[PDB]
Amino acid sequence: AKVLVLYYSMYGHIETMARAVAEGASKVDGAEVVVKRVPETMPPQLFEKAGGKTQTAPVATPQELADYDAIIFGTPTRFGNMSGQMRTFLDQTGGLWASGALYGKLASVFSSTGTGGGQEQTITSTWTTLAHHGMVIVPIGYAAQELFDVSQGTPYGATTIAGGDGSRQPSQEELSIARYQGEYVAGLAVKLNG
Amino acid sequence: AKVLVLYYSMYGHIETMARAVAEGASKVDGAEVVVKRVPETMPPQLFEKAGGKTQTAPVATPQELADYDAIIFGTPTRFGNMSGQMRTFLDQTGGLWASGALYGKLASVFSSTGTGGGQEQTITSTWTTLAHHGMVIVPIGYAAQELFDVSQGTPYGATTIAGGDGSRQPSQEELSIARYQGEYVAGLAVKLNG
Amino acid sequence: AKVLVLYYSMYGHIETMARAVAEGASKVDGAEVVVKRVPETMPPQLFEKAGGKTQTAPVATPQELADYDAIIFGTPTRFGNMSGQMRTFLDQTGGLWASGALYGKLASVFSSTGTGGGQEQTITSTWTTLAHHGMVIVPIGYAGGTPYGATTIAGGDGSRQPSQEELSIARYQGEYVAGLAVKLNG
Amino acid sequence: AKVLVLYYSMYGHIETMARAVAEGASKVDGAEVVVKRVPETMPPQLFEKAGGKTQTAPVATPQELADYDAIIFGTPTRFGNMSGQMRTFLDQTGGLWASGALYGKLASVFSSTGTGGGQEQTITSTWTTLAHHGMVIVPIGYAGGTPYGATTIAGGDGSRQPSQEELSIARYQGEYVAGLAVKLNG
Numbered sequence: 004a005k006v007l008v009l010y011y012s013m014y015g016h017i018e019t020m021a022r023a024v025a026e027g028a029s030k031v032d033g034a035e036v037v038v039k040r041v042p043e044t045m046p047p048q049l050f051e052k053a054g055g056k057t058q059t060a061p062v063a064t065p066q067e068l069a070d071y072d073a074i075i076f077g078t079p080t081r082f083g084n085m086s087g088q089m090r091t092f093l094d095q096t097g098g099l100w101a102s103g104a105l106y107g108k109l110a111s112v113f114s115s116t117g118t119g120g121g122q123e124q125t126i127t128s129t130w131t132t133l134a135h136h137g138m139v140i141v142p143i144g145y146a147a148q149e150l151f152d153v154s155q156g157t158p159y160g161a162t163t164i165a166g167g168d169g170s171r172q173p174s175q176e177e178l179s180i181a182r183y184q185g186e187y188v189a190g191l192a193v194k195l196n197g
Numbered sequence: 198a199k200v201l202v203l204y205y206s207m208y209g210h211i212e213t214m215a216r217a218v219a220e221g222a223s224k225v226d227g228a229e230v231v232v233k234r235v236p237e238t239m240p241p242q243l244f245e246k247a248g249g250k251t252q253t254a255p256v257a258t259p260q261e262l263a264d265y266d267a268i269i270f271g272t273p274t275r276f277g278n279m280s281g282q283m284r285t286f287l288d289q290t291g292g293l294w295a296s297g298a299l300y301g302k303l304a305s306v307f308s309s310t311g312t313g314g315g316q317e318q319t320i321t322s323t324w325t326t327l328a329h330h331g332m333v334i335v336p337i338g339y340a341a342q343e344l345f346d347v348s349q350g351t352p353y354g355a356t357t358i359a360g361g362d363g364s365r366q367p368s369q370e371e372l373s374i375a376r377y378q379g380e381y382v383a384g385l386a387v388k389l390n391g
Numbered sequence: 392a393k394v395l396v397l398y399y400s401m402y403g404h405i406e407t408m409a410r411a412v413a414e415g416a417s418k419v420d421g422a423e424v425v426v427k428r429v430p431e432t433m434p435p436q437l438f439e440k441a442g443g444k445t446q447t448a449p450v451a452t453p454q455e456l457a458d459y460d461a462i463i464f465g466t467p468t469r470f471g472n473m474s475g476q477m478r479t480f481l482d483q484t485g486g487l488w489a490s491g492a493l494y495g496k497l498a499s500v501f502s503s504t505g506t507g508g509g510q511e512q513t514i515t516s517t518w519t520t521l522a523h524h525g526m527v528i529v530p531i532g533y534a535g536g537t538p539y540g541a542t543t544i545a546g547g548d549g550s551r552q553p554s555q556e557e558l559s560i561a562r563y564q565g566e567y568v569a570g571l572a573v574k575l576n577g
Numbered sequence: 578a579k580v581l582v583l584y585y586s587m588y589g590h591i592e593t594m595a596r597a598v599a600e601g602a603s604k605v606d607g608a609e610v611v612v613k614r615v616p617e618t619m620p621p622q623l624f625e626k627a628g629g630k631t632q633t634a635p636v637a638t639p640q641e642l643a644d645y646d647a648i649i650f651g652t653p654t655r656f657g658n659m660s661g662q663m664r665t666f667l668d669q670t671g672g673l674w675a676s677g678a679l680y681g682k683l684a685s686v687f688s689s690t691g692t693g694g695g696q697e698q699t700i701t702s703t704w705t706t707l708a709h710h711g712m713v714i715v716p717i718g719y720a721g722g723t724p725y726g727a728t729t730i731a732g733g734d735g736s737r738q739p740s741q742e743e744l745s746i747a748r749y750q751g752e753y754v755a756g757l758a759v760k761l762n763g
């Protein structure tokens with residue numbers, strides 16, 4: 004089964020989370036995992052002025068989403084919605100919609116916030132779009148503690164706190180939940196698709 | 198795989214929908230389908246005064262939800278939320294929550310409204326609760342037309358219009374979508390659980 | 392202007408928050424504030440088995456909601472929705488709905504939760520209902536903190552009591568809503 | 578009171594609705610109404626390839642939103658969210674957010690959709706953002722019809738134009754919001 008971790012990050016928090024999701028997914032024998040980012044929509048001059056972080060991941064096209072059995076979407080919280088960059092990218096999936104290209108495929112979502120507020124709304128409003136595509140939506144609930152690789156309130160998807168100033172980095176507790184999410188979704192993908 | 202169609206109905210619209218969901222689910226070889234209702238919370242005197250409809254389905258207990266591989270929830274729209282009866286029943290699932298009893302099981306939702314407004318919100322706010330339980334959420338999207346048994350804008354779950362006066366009954370077009378939802382969810386249940 | 396603080400509480404957390412909301416609203420000249428609860432739907436036997444804290448505020452009827460200029464609704468988070476008790480109560484407001492009785496009145500929401508998340512969804516899914524009644528919805532913005540409404544964290548075991556800061560935010564919500572009610576209604 | 582009707586439209590449906598909203602708002606004595614659009618983010622080449630209807634209303638800056646007493650936001654339904662263009666625009670209001678510039682101002686939302694559903698989710702997920710800014714949210718209630726805000730059905734092929742009834746509801750939304758803006762701000 005093929006698993007895509009598709010993300011947008013301005014300052015690297017979601018990028019670090021994406022790498023954790025991919026790490027967990029890679030634990031599943033038979034899962035082929037790929038990490039890509041959506042295009043930055045800001046001119047590079049403005050992105051650099053704003054202290055945006057450069058990233059090694061390849062840029063996804065909308066059309067290539069059709070190639071995967073599961074897609075795990077990562078976005079920062081922007082006033083309780085997904086980012087404009089992710090929204091703009093998803094608005095380019097009308098062709099896939101019309102052909103049924105994503106119907107029945109697995110989808111799951113992770114996020115990041117400065118100070119917590121809005122994270123739930125970001126995830127559930129992303130689910131809405133995934134449902135228009137007919138995707139099967141995978142929340143994380145509160146999984147059995149022994150399934151997390153770090154011993155230790157986010158049932159919709161993994162999250163991390165960036166701090167009011169953006170300077171906080173994901174903790175190992177937060178990354179462990181992201182790794183669980185990837186492993187769990189990839190396992191489902193293999194169970195459904197081989 | 199065992200599939201529960203669990204519903205609340207005051208005037209029979211959701212009951213008719215539930216029967217359609219169950220009919221579709223029953224098409225799947227290997228799916229064992231059962232239909233139950235949540236308890237009425239109104240005293241019978243008031244229910245009868247209000248013109249409520251008597252129903253043959255057995256009354257579910259909260260604990261028995263643990264016995265199923267998939268649960269398809271039906272509720273009328275009450276100001277854009279599930280009914281009080283369904284909410285009250287789900288509030289009795291704390292024990293299941295604590296034990297992980299519903300984690301990873303399939304869930305899907307159908308509804309009914311008088312005049313359309315609120316149906317989307319009813320379904321997505323029901324999804325929230327299912328996600329706290331760790332259930333895998335199955336929207337219906339816009340499925341391939343040849344999969345509906347009646348040739349013919351509801352991607353979250355099947356719906357029906359009861360009319361402002363409650364006198365409209367589900368059309369065959371609406372029931373066909375409910376039947377598709379049951380068949381689709383039961384197929385997934387068998388693919389995951391045998 | 393008349394302000395109703397209308398709440399459901401099983402273990403007392405929302406009850407404590409409701410008192411704070413009312414205190415804040417009472418700081419506003421011209422605001423007449425009343426605190427009521429929705430009925431418990433559980434038989435007392437089952438409420439007591441569950442370790443409930445018996446509520447003694449006056450019980451509101453669904454119909455009296457029409458008498459207020461602003462209503463501030465309190466509910467615990469129950470798997471990211473309002474409680475069944477609050478939902479059952481609101482399901483009895485169909486008569487008001489039909490008559491337009493709450494149309495244009497102010498509404499605002501506060502909640503309580505354990506440490507599991509869901510509070511944001513509880514508040515926003517409560518807003519949906521208020522909108523069907525045509526109520527004007529008042530979030531708190533950036534005045535487990537959300538801009539949607541005041542919250543308190545009760546702890547996984549329910550033993551935490553609202554913090555000083557959480558009660559201050561609840562007081563602010565009452566004061567702010569009551570002020571808007573007076574600006575609109577005198 | 579100053580009322581901004583701020584919209585995004587690709588094929589003209591929200592543009593037509595915005596004109597109606599503005600007409601309604603303009604019926605209110607003391608309301609000063611302005612209609613602006615958010616920038617198109619697509620290069621014109623791609624907008625034209627997609628059959629877009631070139632928009633000519635003045636383009637709003639994110640910062641000028643602070644100048645209004647009420648803002649009525651229009652966006653097409655894009656898989657149950659606002660459009661990427663409206664989202665990109667709102668993502669540029671962080672400077673206002675930090676300064677509290679929109680706090681307490683009135684907000685209301687209208688939308689357009691094909692026949693697929695999602696309009697309710699578009700409106701309510703737009704409300705979330707408005708709440709982060711501390712805006713007071715105005716649904717229309719029972720004054721593809723929703724109590725959340727005016728809508729129009731564009732058809733599966735986009736060829737339907739707003740109906741007379743849909744434009745009447747849009748006018749009502751503008752009139753109602755503008756009236757509340759004048760009651761609050763003169």
Ligand SMILES: Cc1cc2nc3c(=O)[nH]c(=O)nc-3n(C[C@H](O)[C@H](O)[C@H](O)COP(=O)(O)O)c2cc1C
Nearest residue numbers: 012013014015016017079082115116117118119121
């Ligand atoms: C326009 C804008 C809106 C924001 N809205 C929120 C918010 O609603 N809640 C929050 O806690 N943080 C908010 N933030 C902080 C971002 O979520 C934070 O920068 C992001 O999670 C960092 O992830 P990244 O490094 O992957 O870009 C916002 C930031 C911006 C620029």
Ligand SMILES: Cc1cc2nc3c(=O)[nH]c(=O)nc-3n(C[C@H](O)[C@H](O)[C@H](O)COP(=O)(O)O)c2cc1C
Nearest residue numbers: 206207208209210211273276309310311312313315
């Ligand atoms: C308290 C209450 C609230 C309602 N809210 C809505 C609503 O938000 N939207 C709507 O279109 N119909 C609404 N209705 C109509 C119900 O959805 C309708 O009675 C129901 O779908 C019938 O299903 P049933 O026969 O299975 O009970 C409401 C009815 C009641 C009693």
Ligand SMILES: Cc1cc2nc3c(=O)[nH]c(=O)nc-3n(C[C@H](O)[C@H](O)[C@H](O)COP(=O)(O)O)c2cc1C
Nearest residue numbers: 400401402403404405467470503504505506507509
């Ligand atoms: C049925 C049920 C569901 C609950 N769901 C959640 C939840 O989704 N998230 C959460 O953090 N706490 C949850 N809780 C814990 C309650 O929110 C907490 O006990 C409640 O806020 C107490 O408020 P009260 O003392 O006013 O009743 C739940 C509790 C019950 C009984």
Ligand SMILES: Cc1cc2nc3c(=O)[nH]c(=O)nc-3n(C[C@H](O)[C@H](O)[C@H](O)COP(=O)(O)O)c2cc1C
Nearest residue numbers: 586587588589590591653656689690691692693695
């Ligand atoms: C990316 C995209 C997603 C869409 N999603 C939906 C949808 O979820 N439901 C719907 O009924 N129509 C949907 N539509 C159709 C639009 O809502 C319709 O073309 C739009 O309302 C037109 O408004 P405008 O003319 O102002 O651009 C979508 C269109 C596009 C381009």
Ligand SMILES: O=C1C=CC(=O)C=C1
Nearest residue numbers: 329470505506507547
């Ligand atoms: O979903 C939840 C249920 C109960 C609780 O305490 C926390 C979260």
Ligand SMILES: O=C1C=CC(=O)C=C1
Nearest residue numbers: 276311312361488523
């Ligand atoms: O919001 C609504 C309430 C009741 C009804 O019948 C239709 C809509």
Ligand SMILES: O=C1C=CC(=O)C=C1
Nearest residue numbers: 135656691692693733
């Ligand atoms: O989800 C949808 C996408 C496009 C459209 O036209 C209708 C619905």
Ligand SMILES: O=C1C=CC(=O)C=C1
Nearest residue numbers: 082117118167674709
């Ligand atoms: O709503 C919010 C916006 C920005 C931020 O940094 C934190 C919260």
